[PDB]
Design a protein that fits this description.
heterotetramer, A: nine-stranded parallel beta sheet, 12 helices, B: alpha/beta, Rossmann fold, 2 domains, six-stranded mixed beta sheet, binds ligand F9F, binds pyridoxal-5'-phosphate, binds sodium ion, Trp_synth_beta (chains B, C), EC 4.2.1.20 (chains B, C)
């Protein structure tokens, strides 16, 4: 399908940035996670980034570590996550859906079979957090055979060789890292990335989304100003879940408030 | 691109977030340079001799083998400073850290021997050491935690996931992914992403080099087999490396069988797990059917790394090395036998290697065989574990 | 009549019941013969090298001495099999037992290291070992009691007198006075009746012989001083012996000062006791004004032999060796310093020797001096003793 | 004085053996120990062997170890023991009194001063249990300067050289060891000692008293039959003390009964 290409063309027509929330599938349970995701979309999310709970999320800080643990406390499995993905797509035909995976969950029952299941449920992209471009060949090949965009991370450290590789190999969007370290709202990135954003456009890369530490409206506007196509936010979204565990209704109200503010910051 | 092959056949690789690739490339380049540098080799040899106590003895065990055609030697890594083989490679990695201009060390530890080894190397060489340890392990390894703190290391309990070794491995990599410019990650076994399996082998290979020289001197020939326990693979690859090209020499790795392979309560991923991708490598893993990483179980917590070094998976796949398992009860009997018949208290880890050599002898007592067991550590640390089991019999 | 002089000046002798004189004469004759026997020397050298791990390292301590004109080396008896120097002489005495046709060993022990050393030597050489231990010591040394029992030794609690080391010494001699024809008494220090002070020195003197060779190789000269803790005198006479005729080399023995000499709660009989006759010798003793034998007190139970070897009393009397004391608190600070700055956990016994070298350096930091401390054992055994004191500060 | 010489001449006139009990001075207290000793003499003891409580009695088995501990529980000191010795001699002018000492108590305040105190209170002999003949010179010289007999032990193992030494050096009596090991009634000696007794008489030794494990009348008669001048018994006497601690009156009755039976076994 062409869901990212259609989204970025529509956003470009409106001189608009993308706002893309991350959540963990099944955090804090399947039913409440489906309600959370519908609330994110109704509040104006342009695309989704969705994590499958994994025992060892070594690219994630404590907020998303604790999201994975809540989903496991609710008995959430990868099979249940794919059932959720099919339902989400059945409700929402055009929104791009990206997964954040760890390699073992993709490799476990065969790389090709993983990407075939992605295609069946209507996923648009997969970011495998612990597969660097150097190891990516079988993942990107399987992704593209099943009409899935393989997403790569561009560190702020990225040398010219790596920018060329990410530009050549990635599709859908380029994940522009704000900083070194792991996911978390407590650490803000401070890279102008004007040159990285400029070099990616020169090398005809998929449009850049700036992510890691994006927690406020001004960071969304700043990302777009710097020439990024949009911004991704997770720990900030997940923190609203963690804060409001005792009140599922207030949790949805605060998620709606936050996403509506972050999306407003992307508009012309 | 890399200078060295990151794979052993299909096994190994560099499965880390992109942000960590420069740290691994920097480490590989420093290692390749260090291995060509006579000054680095001389400094490492000086520390191994004058601080750690190398060469270690090779002890013949005539009381154990009496009345059989087995000759059994023990390579005495239990006599190395710190009481286990881990000291060899932490001294080399600490020197690599200094070669790269780093002043800080990060280490993971399970039962605590790698934490203690990392802390003692850091104390000697003037490095600031922080050690991640699963909160469950912190709770049950107070002696090793106290040793690390006496040596000036920071011990950081890890509460995420299962609060055990794999979770400390994750936390060490999360820290390194922000701190690599000033901190070296001193990985504790011959596993993880390239170049660690290669580095740890080369910084342990004096075990096998000395064993070869010592057995030639005493016996005038190579061993029929060298036998080593396999938790993550470092003491075994250190014994095996110098014999790999001696095709007459058996290489036997012993994984923990725990309560028995059939119970599922074991730590034998190489022969009874499933290949996966975790901790930066493609290797056999303890994992659920769904691909969630599991714990290894053994009476010996030191054998509970829930995967295995990729070079062992490779040597197995080509038939150069053979891998077996030994249960808790077999290891316990070997522990008691060595104490009573040789006056050596072995680590329960090493007791798994000895138990398999005892089986090789007892099953075929008229088979002529010259065996070397890598006695990877001493077992003072295990006497209460053994007391608690014996007392409950 | 004897073959060798039983005295060192006025100190030493053979103050045992008449019934035990044939046992001492037999032992002296076997020892004199053994020292002329190349086969005995070769067997002892084989055990020391291939079982115990000799030679031990000589470790330079630049982190400790930085900014001073002290050069400090540690003789690493902590790396000997069993974790202390005691292993050297028990292997020699076990060989003497076999030379005399004996199949059984009797030993005394206080804090338990001599019991463990005796048990491991007996296990290796196929001897039946029984160990006397004061009931009070049995109660507070469960780890060492368990080690002795794992190695197949009988541990016999002693309830007579103060139920501590001197009472175990008595019980060992009471047993030997009936069993000498089939049992050897494997005395644990360079003390007791002749020929034990002589035998234990000669079976420890490789400490000083190796130190001399190692310091000549590294420094091109002899040490200014060699420094050793003194409980009964064995590790110190083993370091000192080969330097006695090198008149330029200081010989410094360190007794435990406990809570302070002035408190009376110490273990420094050589400088702060009174000559008496007990345990088969005339020597300085901890004793009441009325002549009842008292206990030594130290934070380190291993230094609590309540007398001292007669050769140390002699070397002091002629001014060849100097004896000093170090308090509990000084020993504790040295323990912490070595852990933090060299990554070596020393025995609290050995920490007394290190503390005095630290004082020699710190008091006169611009004095040029080349010092060797005998690091008589490792301090894994002491980490809870040290934890309990630190935690209560 | 000539107390041993006069005793053995009188016993020889009556073709009689000596019976010599051992007790620890001050066991179980000073007053009861003085009553015990008077009871031993009234019941027919020919001489006494008296121990001074010592911290480390390495020639003694458990019975006499426990006697030393009872005396220490009562605060008994060597000074109090010498006060007791003076009183015993003041009551009983002719009975030979022998001490069983350990070397440290003799050496403690000077060997000569120890033997001078012995002479002052009227002691006849000293046996220093942990001084072999090889080390005995200063002890025997000080003893003889103060009219004290130095007593030596003759083991059953004794070679010819040792018999000659003990014969030359000892006075008062020769202590003939029944066996190897330590004091105790639970272990009986089994050496004919006819040759040792014969060799000692040939070398003009002080008369032999057989001791260690002597607990019954038949052992007293057997000692005399073998040509010994008498027998010494301790653990058997001390065991009667230990058994009757709770009844001081019955303790004295049982001591009287036992000593009267053992002395009867010595008579022609
Ligand atoms: O807002 P934050 O700081 O929580 O960051 C959002 C992260 N969510 S995500 O799925 O984009 C994401 C993307 C990449 C990650 O690791 C990798 F870079 F190594 F690949 C991890 C998570
Ligand atoms: O009847 P037993 O078995 O208790 O023996 C009596 C012992 N009492 S004693 O004073 O004669 C006596 C004599 C000699 C002793 O030791 C020595 F031989 F080494 F000198 C000890 C005690
Ligand atoms: C750490 C340890 C092991 C297991 O680790 P490997 O990397 O497999 O060698 C084995 N023996 C001892 C004594 C250890 O300390
Ligand atoms: C036994 C012991 C000592 C004290 O005994 P010495 O005979 O005086 O040497 C000292 N250090 C250690 C480590 C010991 O084990
Ligand atoms: Na493993
Ligand atoms: Na002492």
């Amino acid at each position: 399908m062409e869901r990212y290409e259609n989204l970025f063309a529509q956003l470009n027509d409106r001189r608009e940035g993308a706002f893309v929330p991350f959540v963990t599938l099944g955090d804090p349970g399947i039913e409440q996670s489906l309600k959370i995701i519908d609330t994110l979309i109704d509040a104006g999310a342009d695309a989704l980034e969705l994590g499958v709970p994994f025992s060892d999320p070594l690219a994630d800080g404590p907020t998303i570590q604790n999201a994975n643990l809540r989903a496991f406390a609710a008995g959430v499995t990868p099979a249940q996550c794919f059932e959720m993905l099919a339902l989400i797509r059945e409700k929402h035909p055009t929104i791009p859906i990206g997964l954040l995976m760890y390699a073992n969950l993709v490799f476990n029952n065969g790389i090709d079979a993983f990407y075939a299941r992605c295609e069946q449920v209507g996923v648009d992209s997969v970011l495998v957090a612990d597969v660097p471009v150097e190891e990516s060949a079988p993942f990107r090949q399987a992704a593209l055979r099943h009409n899935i965009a393989p997403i790569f991370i561009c560190p702020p450290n990225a040398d010219d060789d790596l920018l060329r590789q990410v530009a050549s190999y990635g599709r859908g969007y380029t994940y522009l890292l704000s900083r070194s370290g792991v996911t978390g709202a407590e650490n803000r990135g401070a890279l102008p990335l004007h040159h990285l954003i400029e070099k990616l456009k020169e090398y005809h890369a998929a449009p850049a989304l700036q992510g890691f530490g994006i927690s406020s409206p001004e960071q969304v506007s700043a990302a777009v100003r710097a020439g990024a196509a949009g911004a991704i936010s997770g720990s900030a979204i997940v923190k609203i879940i963690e804060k409001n565990l005792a009140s599922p209704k207030q949790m949805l109200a605060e998620l709606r408030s936050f996403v509506s503010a972050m999306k407003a910051a992307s508009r012309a | 691109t890399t200078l060295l092959n990151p794979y052993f056949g299909e096994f190994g690789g560099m499965y880390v977030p992109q942000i960590l690739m420069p740290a691994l490339n920097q480490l590989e380049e420093a290692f390749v340079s260090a291995q060509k540098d006579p000054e680095f080799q001389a400094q490492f040899a000086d520390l191994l001799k004058n601080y750690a106590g190398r060469p270690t003895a090779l002890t013949k065990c005539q009381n154990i083998t009496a009345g059989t055609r087995t000759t059994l030697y023990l390579k005495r890594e239990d006599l190395l400073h710190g009481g286990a083989h881990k000291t060899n490679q932490v001294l080399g990695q600490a020197l690599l850290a200094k070669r790269m201009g780093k002043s800080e060390i990060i280490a993971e530890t399970g039962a605590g021997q790698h934490g203690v080894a990392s802390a003692l190397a850091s104390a000697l060489l003037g490095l600031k050491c922080r050690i991640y340890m699963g909160a469950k392990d912190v709770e049950r390894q107070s002696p090793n935690v106290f040793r690390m703190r006496l040596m000036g290391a920071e011990v950081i309990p890890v509460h995420s996931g299962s609060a055990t070794l794999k979770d400390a491995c994750n936390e060490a990599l999360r820290d390194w992914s922000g701190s690599y410019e000033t901190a070296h990650y001193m990985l504790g076994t011959a596993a993880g992403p390239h170049p660690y399996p290669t580095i740890v082998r080369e910084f342990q290979r004096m075990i096998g080099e000395e064993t070869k020289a010592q057995i030639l001197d005493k016996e005038g020939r190579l061993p029929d087999a060298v036998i080593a326990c396999v938790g993550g693979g470092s003491n075994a690859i250190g014994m095996f490396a110098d014999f790999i090209n001696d095709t007459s020499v058996g290489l036997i790795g012993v994984e923990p069988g725990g309560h028995g392979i059939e119970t599922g309560e074991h730590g034998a991923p190489l022969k009874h797990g499933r290949v996966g991708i975790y901790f930066g490598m493609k290797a056999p893993m303890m994992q659920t059917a769904d691909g969630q990483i599991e714990e290894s179980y053994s009476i010996s917590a030191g054998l509970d790394f829930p995967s295995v070094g990729p070079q062992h998976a490779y040597l197995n796949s080509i038939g150069r090395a053979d891998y077996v398992s030994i249960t808790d009860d077999e290891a316990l009997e070997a522990f008691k036998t060595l104490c009573r018949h040789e006056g050596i208290i072995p680590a329960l880890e090493s007791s798994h290697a000895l138990a398999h050599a005892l089986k090789m002898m007892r099953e075929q007592p008229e088979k002529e065989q010259l065996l070397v067991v890598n006695l990877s550590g001493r077992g003072d640390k295990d006497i209460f574990t053994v007391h608690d089991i014996l007392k409950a019999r």
